[PDB]
Write an enzyme that holds these catalytic residues in place. Structure first.
Site, PDB file in Angstrom:
ATOM      1  N   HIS A  55      -8.108  11.374   0.252  1.00 43.85           N
ATOM      2  CA  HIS A  55      -7.434  10.092   0.137  1.00 43.85           C
ATOM      3  C   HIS A  55      -6.098  10.176   0.870  1.00 43.85           C
ATOM      4  CE1 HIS A  55      -5.352   6.620  -1.773  1.00 43.85           C
ATOM      5  NE2 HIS A  55      -6.557   6.078  -1.687  1.00 43.85           N
ATOM      6  N   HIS A 100       0.787  -1.230   0.000  1.00 46.54           N
ATOM      7  CA  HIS A 100       0.000   0.000   0.000  1.00 46.54           C
ATOM      8  C   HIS A 100       0.819   1.280   0.000  1.00 46.54           C
ATOM      9  CE1 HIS A 100      -3.276   2.799   1.525  1.00 46.54           C
ATOM     10  NE2 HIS A 100      -3.766   2.319   0.394  1.00 46.54           N
TER      11      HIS A 100
HETATM   12  N1  LIG Z   1      -9.564  -1.978  -4.600  1.00 43.81           N
HETATM   13  C1  LIG Z   1      -9.460  -0.816  -5.501  1.00 43.81           C
HETATM   14  C2  LIG Z   1     -10.313   0.312  -4.943  1.00 43.81           C
HETATM   15  O1  LIG Z   1     -11.421  -0.238  -4.232  1.00 43.81           O
HETATM   16  C3  LIG Z   1      -9.460   1.201  -4.023  1.00 43.81           C
HETATM   17  C4  LIG Z   1      -8.085   1.313  -4.245  1.00 43.81           C
HETATM   18  C5  LIG Z   1      -7.299   2.123  -3.419  1.00 43.81           C
HETATM   19  C6  LIG Z   1      -7.881   2.821  -2.362  1.00 43.81           C
HETATM   20  O2  LIG Z   1      -7.104   3.606  -1.552  1.00 43.81           O
HETATM   21  C7  LIG Z   1      -9.252   2.704  -2.141  1.00 43.81           C
HETATM   22  C8  LIG Z   1     -10.047   1.897  -2.962  1.00 43.81           C
END
Ligand SMILES: NC[C@@H](O)c1ccc(O)cc1
Ligand code: VO4
Length: 424
Positions: free
Chosen positions: A318, A102
């Protein structure tokens, strides 16, 4: 500017709100250095889009994509990359179930030196379009005079710590990057690296990763002076049947360490519904009803996304940040920007009667400590002193508010674009 903390550009806000902001094209521009090679660590990739973010003159330089994909997804990524001869891949081993790679990081090797970028964005268009995302930019690290004896290390031990992070992958392609880092002078670095890597950790090794790494640094390099803890993130794992199982016991225990109110910031349905993207912003907020229904207790800690300070209340987060503001929120004892969301997967959980820390995923962030700048605390920059990117104090969910949950329908009211949301 001692922090070098930036937000990504958001399309469709007044230009004043993008003045100190960066798009990936800006990061990769020739003004930042004459590029020779790069490594792109991330979770999701759109290769065609990615290559296009590089300046035409640099588009053919070697790129290493570091990912955690397996089976069919891995196949798909290789297929994406196949057309580009200059692109290699490194699959990061994920031996623990439900782990992800991640980490979002760029290693940028130039003719003139080396740069490290640690950020929160996936390498896809939508993550860089209308979201709130965060970036830390290292200084330009010069090569160590090929004739001299120096460590190139900083007081924060960033160079050794970054190497240890890359070493944990046990990957041939990263050893080359490790050797490059060895050759550069990272002594000007004033942040601490906090990483997570998949494993089960015992004794002294517990301090190396996840929330115990954070605890260790806060014990050693902060001093203690009712100062709340703030956590802000876009993904929520299964934390347990109540707050005492993990969130308030080991997690909060690490966060409040120095030499207690907990505010959690996570978009409500209403925040998402009226965002610049509308409901599809919720595609990047993957809190599932299966998880949420196990832990209704958690939602009394939730606070709305609000970022009038940065013109971004409508740009869904995000970014993930964690911090320790004073009782009146005018200053902070520390600030963390990282890839790590609110999960045991990312942060670590204690196993075997507390002698073992289990972490599922790769995560990476930078910790800003006042001691590294010769201070006791940072004053908060009230209008995007540390540039906190969202509003304080955080505002509690109203009585009619719900946490955004990605896999249930929202059909009573249309979003910004006049659409409903019916996942299926
Ligand atoms: N699994 C891909 C998508 O659902 C997703 C991908 C990255 C993130 O931070 C959040 C959601
Ligand atoms: O890329 V994920 O929070």
């Amino acid at each position: 500017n001692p922090f070098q903390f930036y937000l990504t550009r958001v399309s469709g806000v007044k230009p004043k709100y993008n003045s100190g902001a960066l798009h990936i094209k800006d990061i990769l521009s020739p003004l930042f250095g004459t590029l020779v090679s790069s490594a792109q660590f991330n979770y999701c990739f759109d290769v065609d889009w990615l290559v296009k973010q590089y300046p035409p003159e640099f588009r053919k330089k070697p790129i290493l994509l570091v990912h955690g994909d397996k089976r069919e997804a891995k196949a798909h990524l290789h297929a994406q990359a196949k057309p580009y001869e200059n692109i290699s891949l490194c699959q990061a081993k994920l031996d623990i179930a439900f782990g992800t790679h991640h980490t979002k990081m760029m290693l940028l090797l130039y003719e003139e030196g080396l740069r490290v970028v640690i950020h929160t964005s996936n390498l896809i268009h939508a993550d860089w379009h209308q979201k709130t995302q965060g970036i830390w930019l290292s200084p330009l690290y010069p090569r160590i005079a090929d004739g001299t004896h120096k460590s190139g290390e900083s007081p924060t031990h960033f160079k050794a710590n970054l190497i240890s992070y890359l070493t944990a992958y046990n990957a041939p392609s990263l050893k080359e990057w490790i050797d490059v880092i060895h050759k550069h002078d990272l002594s000007e670095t004033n942040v601490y690296l906090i990483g997570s890597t998949p494993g089960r950790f015992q004794g002294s090794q517990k301090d190396n990763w996840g929330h115990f790494r954070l605890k260790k640094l806060l014990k050693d390099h902060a001093s203690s002076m009712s100062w709340p803890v703030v956590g802000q993130f876009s993904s929520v794992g299964s934390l347990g049947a109540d707050e005492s199982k993990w969130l308030c016991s080991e997690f909060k225990e690490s966060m409040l360490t120095l030499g207690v109110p907990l505010y959690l910031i996570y978009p409500s349905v209403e925040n998402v519904r009226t965002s610049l993207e509308g409901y599809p912003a919720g595609g990047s907020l993957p809190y599932s009803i299966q998880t949420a229904e196990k832990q209704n207790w958690l939602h009394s800690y939730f606070h709305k996304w609000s970022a009038e300070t940065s013109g971004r209340s409508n740009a869904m987060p995000h970014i993930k940040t964690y911090m320790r503001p004073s009782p009146d929120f005018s200053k902070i004892a520390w600030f963390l920007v990282t890839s790590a969301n609110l999960s045991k997967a990312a942060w670590g959980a204690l196993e075997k009667n507390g002698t073992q820390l289990m972490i599922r995923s790769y995560e990476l962030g930078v910790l800003f400590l006042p001691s590294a700048l010769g201070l006791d605390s940072f004053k908060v920059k009230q209008k995007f002193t540390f540039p906190v990117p969202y509003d304080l104090p955080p505002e509690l969910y109203g009585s009619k508010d719900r946490p955004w949950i990605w896999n249930i329908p929202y059909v009573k009211a249309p979003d910004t674009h006049g659409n409903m949301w019916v996942p299926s």
